[model samples]
Target: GSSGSSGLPWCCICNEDATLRCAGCDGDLYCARCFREGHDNFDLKEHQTSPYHPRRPCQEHSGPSSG
Candidate 1:
């Protein structure tokens, strides 16, 4: 297995924590890097995120962009 938590996938772009989960349909989660960088101009920004994932500090996190 990937040995990484979430067992989902090590970022849709790079290796790192798969944080930043989309609050929209499907609720697909992704790391902040890809969620903000990898996806770039696509509907990535249209996808709302809960910032960091579990095992990390979810404090003061943005509750999902209104965009």
Candidate 2:
């Protein structure tokens, strides 16, 4: 279908198609393997993790600009 990695889900650490993310790193998105190796430290041990979802509220609208 596509030709490049554009608009594709990939691991930020190993550059492989990923589905998980490090909550400690603000859910940066990564692969299962990367998520494990990346958190091999005492700090990340407390960074609760969950599914990866890049979707977030966009810019502000200010309630129709109060026109």
Candidate 3:
């Protein structure tokens, strides 16, 4: 049991726990309700979305050091 929201993926729009991910928009996550409504927009219908799994990629301070 965690004590904080740290490491938790939240909806980009509403800040709720995200259950889906939009890969077409820089990996933005969203809940079911938000995703459906947001993607319903005329232009946003084309954004590819997928399930959002809580996996840490550790992209912070990422750097390519070929040594």
Candidate 4:
């Protein structure tokens, strides 16, 4: 489970310990690295519409798997 503490166990996305949280949505937290990395360039309006509002490219797309 995740908490609102510094060492709180947060998801990978919410693990960003850089900048403050988003002003519009309290569900998402953005760090300075994410800001510089352009994660904040998303459409807040569209993203907020869904309950499972995960940042784009939720999963890392890679080549064929090795057996």
Most lDDT-accurate candidate: 3
Colliding residue pairs in candidate 1: none
Can you rank all candidates by lDDT, best first?
A: 3, 2, 1, 4
Score every model by TM-score.
0.44, 0.48, 0.57, 0.30
Error of 2 at 47 (Å): 2.1
lDDT of 2 by residue, 1-67 (tens): 4453443345667655556666665556666677777566658767776665444322233565432
Report, for every candidate in turn, its global Cα lDDT versus the true structure: 0.56, 0.59, 0.68, 0.43
How many clashes does each candidate structure show, in the order listed? Answer: 0, 0, 0, 1
| lDDT-better candidate, 1 vs 3 | 3
The TM-score obtained by model 2 is 0.48
Q: Write the per-residue lDDT of candidate 3 for residues 1-67, one digit (tens) a residue.
A: 4453443477776766677777776677877777888687757656788888654432235676655
lDDT of model 4, residue 15: 65
RMSD over all Cα atoms, model 1:
7.8
Worst 10-residue stretch by lDDT in candidate 2? 53-62
lDDT at position 27, candidate 3: 76
